[PDB]
């Protein structure tokens, strides 16, 4: 019912984090998998009815989908000149603010 | 899914967002500091400064007794 | 695919109406801490 590829989780660099966000783990479906305490697995995986319902709750309602992120915003259009102007403005504003705070107080 | 707005994770990790908001938040903080330090807070909302709690006229707590002359009574009680 | 989103929405106003006065009041309260009786 749920297509994992259409959930917008394909733009994640870390493979382990990507598998975590879809509620999937290739290691756990193996019949010889043993968790830290030492209990064998029954082959269910993360979710027993993963095939019946498509995916898990993690793969149903994700809260971090880089695919839906805006194409812009990963690069600043104003470039280096904008950053230089911002640096000048923030230095000037910090100086003005500290001067106003000192002047209006009782020294 | 999504209701048709930019994700909060996308906005909060933007150079444009942190360039715009490196000015607005400190500006508001400084504006509030100047509002308090310049004495505007006392005058706008009528709060007593530490030296204006008791005047030379009365050395007790204020008490308002009239409902329709309340404006004049509180004007008299606040006299410095 | 390309996703384009509006900048100003109802959520923008809802966020800012609670965010701006909060920062102003926090600055005022911080200034209040250094007043000597």
């Amino acid at each position: 019912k749920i297509d994992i590829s259409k959930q917008g989780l394909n733009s994640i660099q870390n493979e382990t984090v990507k598998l975590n966000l879809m509620g999937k783990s290739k290691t756990m479906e193996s019949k010889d998998w043993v968790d830290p305490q030492g209990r064998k697995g029954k082959g269910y995986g993360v979710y027993r009815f993963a095939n019946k319902y498509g995916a898990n709750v993690d793969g149903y309602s994700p809260i971090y989908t880089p695919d839906t992120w805006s194409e812009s915003g990963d690069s600043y259009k104003l470039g280096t000149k904008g950053l230089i102007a911002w640096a000048g403005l923030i230095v000037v504003l910090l100086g003005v603010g500290i001067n106003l705070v000192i002047s209006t107080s009782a020294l | 899914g999504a209701t048709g707005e930019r994700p909060f994770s996308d906005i909060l990790t933007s150079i444009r967002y942190w360039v715009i908001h490196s000015i607005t938040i400190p500006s508001l903080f400084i504006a509030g500091w100047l509002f308090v330090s310049t004495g505007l807070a006392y005058d706008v909302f009528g709060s007593p400064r530490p030296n204006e709690y008791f005047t030379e006229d009365r050395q007790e707590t204020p008490l308002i007794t009239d409902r329709f002359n309340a404006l004049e009574q509180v004007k008299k009680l606040s006299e410095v | 695919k390309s996703y384009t989103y509006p900048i100003f929405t109802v959520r923008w106003l809802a966020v800012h109406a609670l965010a701006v006065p909060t920062v102003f009041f926090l600055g005022a309260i911080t200034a209040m801490q250094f007043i000597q009786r």
């Binding site: 104003l78 403005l89 | 000015i23 | -």
Partner: peptide, 30 residues
């Protein structure tokens, strides 16, 4: 004048925000 100081402080903030956001805002308006 005390309120004038705060208004004068707030003016460059509005100027900077308009300078940084006018383009995409006009794009969204159309």
């Amino acid at each position: 004048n005390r309120f004038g100081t705060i208004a004068l402080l707030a003016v460059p903030v509005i100027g900077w925000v308009l300078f940084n956001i006018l383009g995409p805002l006009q794009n969204q308006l159309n």
